[PDB]
Every structure is written in C-alpha cells, then in structure tokens.
C-alpha cells in the first residue's frame, strides 16, 4: 500500500511485456547508454589515435568506411588502462580523439550484459522455473569480458581490446595469433570443439525431431502446423528417433533419456566456450599456446621443420607488420 511497495510490485511484475526486475534497473540504463553511443560513434565519429602515436584511424561511416570496415576504434595506447570518462577530457573533441567512446561503450556493455544475465535468473525465479539458464549465458558473457576487459587488463591498455567492428575483429584475431599462438592453445581447441560440436549436435537433434514428427498435417499445409502451442502430447516419436540413431552408429551411443540429451546439448557448447574464454583470459597474461618451433632435430643437429614451423612463419609475418610504427625496440613486450 506504500509507494515503494507499489513500485516493487511493478518492477518485479511478470505481466509487463518485457520483464524489468531489479537487474533491469542496471540492464536497461547501461545497455541503452551503450547502444546510443555505439550507433552515433559507428555512423559519425572522428578518427581515433589508437596506437598513441598520433596516427588516427578512421572508423565511422561518415569518414569513409563501410559496414565491414567500420568500427568503434579502441582507446589510445597513451591512455592505457586509465579510466577515460568524458569529464576527464577537457573537451569532447579531445575525448573523441583519444578513443573515449570505446571505453564508454565497453564499460556500459559489460555492466549491462552482466545485468542481462541476472535478469535471466530473476524472471526464472518469478516464473517458478529452475534457475540455470543464466549459467549458460555466462559463457558468451565471459567471452565478451575476456576480449573487451580482461585482455586489456593483462596487456595494460584498452587499445588492445577488440574493436567494435567487423574488420577490427579480424585485426584482433590475427595479431592475437602472432603474439600468443592461440591456434596451438588447447583452450581454443576446446572452444572449436565447443562450437563445431555444438552446431553438430544442434543439427543432429534438430534432424531427429524433424525426422520423427507424427502425422498431423496434409501435403498442402506446413508441417509446423501439426504442433499446437499449449498442447500436452509429444509432437514427435522419440522411440523412432532413438531407433534410428541407435542403428546409425550403434545402440549404446544414443540418448534414450530426453532430459539427459538436452542436458548434453547445454553442456557441450557452454563448457567449450567457458574454456576458450579462459584461454583469452590466460593469454592476457602471456601464457601462450604451444611452441613447437625447432623441436624436431636430426642427428647432425639441424632443424627439420614441421607444420608448426610453417604456422610460425605466418605468425612472423603478422607480428613484423602489425602496429608498424608503434615499436621502437626489438621485442613486442606489449
């Protein structure tokens, strides 16, 4: 009957079109801040001196980019890991020159996507569900925090964060391979098994349900009209799908339990993305992937090359050409 209790009843109401909740009190202002700043910076933002060497990189559509080449460029290397809000910048043009919008978007996005995760817990609690959908969303949240926050922290600069652009993402990937050999890191290998396996199991589970649908339609209408929303009966023969996949490989290698099967669909990509998020987070502190350069040696002592050595020649080509004016000394220790 009080004013706060009527506000609490509206915030936690499951009858709103979108659930707000108390995490939405952090989710909606931070993500709409980051969305507003991203759209304005992607369309029209002046070039950013990313490498701190007064060589400004254009990233917006009004400075000659397209959708692929356009980016919100990371902060200046001269800033480093320093906090650069607008009020610490003496003019907005100085803030725009030094890659200020990147720090505003990334910090509001990472706060807002952690609050999106807690909002996913919160609605499940108000709906009487089991809680752990937001644990599955923690795997892309850990990945976003690794490339936007954790890898800047270990390298000591927001300039080494992943650019908010399509071609900036590929620039982030190639320099990471030259400096950390992520392909030879087993945590990226588990991540590739997470997304190759996850899209395998998605196409596998989606095939066997669609293969074993029960006749409820004619040849003229769509097959999806055989399902009614809110029906209690099963819409596909799971015995027929188990008998198919049990004959495709062999019988003992197939889930007859649909609850164990859907748990395996949740676990395989999420654990795979968790591990590759802890690959980026541990290559942030330069615990790099496997180095097998000049490891095969013949009897005289000469180096016999392997495929890791040919991979090393491609790593050498990226690292001698990346940030080509930024280096003054023979080791890229940053």
């Amino acid at each position: 009957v009080s004013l706060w209790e009527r506000f609490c009843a509206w915030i936690t109401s499951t009858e709103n079109r979108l659930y707000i909740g108390w995490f939405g009190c952090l989710m909606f202002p931070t993500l709409l801040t980051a969305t507003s700043c991203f759209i304005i910076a992607f369309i029209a933002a002046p070039p950013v001196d990313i490498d701190g060497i007064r060589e400004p990189v254009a990233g917006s559509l009004l400075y000659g980019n397209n959708i692929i080449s356009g980016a919100v460029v990371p902060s200046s290397n001269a800033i480093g890991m320093h906090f650069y809000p607008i009020w610490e910048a003496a003019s907005i043009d100085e803030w725009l020159y030094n890659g200020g919008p990147y720090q505003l978007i990334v910090l509001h996005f990472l706060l807002g996507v952690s609050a999106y995760m807690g909002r996913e817990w919160e609605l499940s609690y108000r709906l009487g569900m089991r809680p752990w959908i937001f644990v599955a969303f923690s795997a892309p949240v850990a990945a976003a925090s690794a490339v936007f926050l954790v890898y800047p922290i270990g390298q000591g600069s927001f300039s080494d964060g992943m650019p908010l652009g399509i071609s900036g993402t590929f620039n982030f990937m190639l320099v990471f391979q030259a400096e950390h050999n992520i392909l030879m890191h087993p945590f990226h290998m588990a991540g590739v098994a997470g997304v190759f396996g996850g899209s395998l199991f998605s196409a596998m589970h989606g095939s066997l349900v669609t293969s074993s649908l029960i006749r409820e339609t004619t040849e003229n209408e769509s097959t999806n009209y055989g399902y009614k929303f809110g029906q209690e009966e099963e819409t596909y023969n799971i015995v027929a799908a188990h008998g198919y996949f049990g004959r495709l490989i062999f019988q003992y290698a197939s889930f007859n339990n649909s609850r164990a099967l859907h748990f395996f669909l949740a676990l395989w990509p999420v654990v795979g993305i968790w591990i590759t998020s802890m690959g980026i987070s541990t290559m942030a502190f330069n615990l790099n992937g496997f180095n097998f350069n000049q490891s095969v040696v013949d009897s005289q002592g000469r180096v016999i090359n392997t495929w890791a050595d040919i991979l090393n020649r491609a790593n050498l080509g990226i690292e001698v050409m990346h940030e080509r004016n930024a280096h003054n000394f023979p080791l890229d220790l940053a």
Partner: peptide
C-alpha cells in the same frame, strides 16, 4: 553518399526488429 545507404539499411534493420518484438503475433492457446 553510400553512407546514406549504409545508415538506411542499419536503421531499417532495427525498425524490423522493433516491429518483430512489439507487433509480434501473440502465441495463443485454443
């Protein structure tokens, strides 16, 4: 001049997302 096309395609894509969320066909039982 092509940034006019790039802006219109992105803003036009977000307008489809707006109508897909708030003007969706409501799922109804029976």
């Amino acid at each position: 001049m092509e940034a006019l096309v790039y802006t219109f395609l992105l803003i036009g894509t977000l307008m489809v997302i707006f109508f897909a969320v708030f003007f969706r066909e409501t799922p109804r039982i029976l």
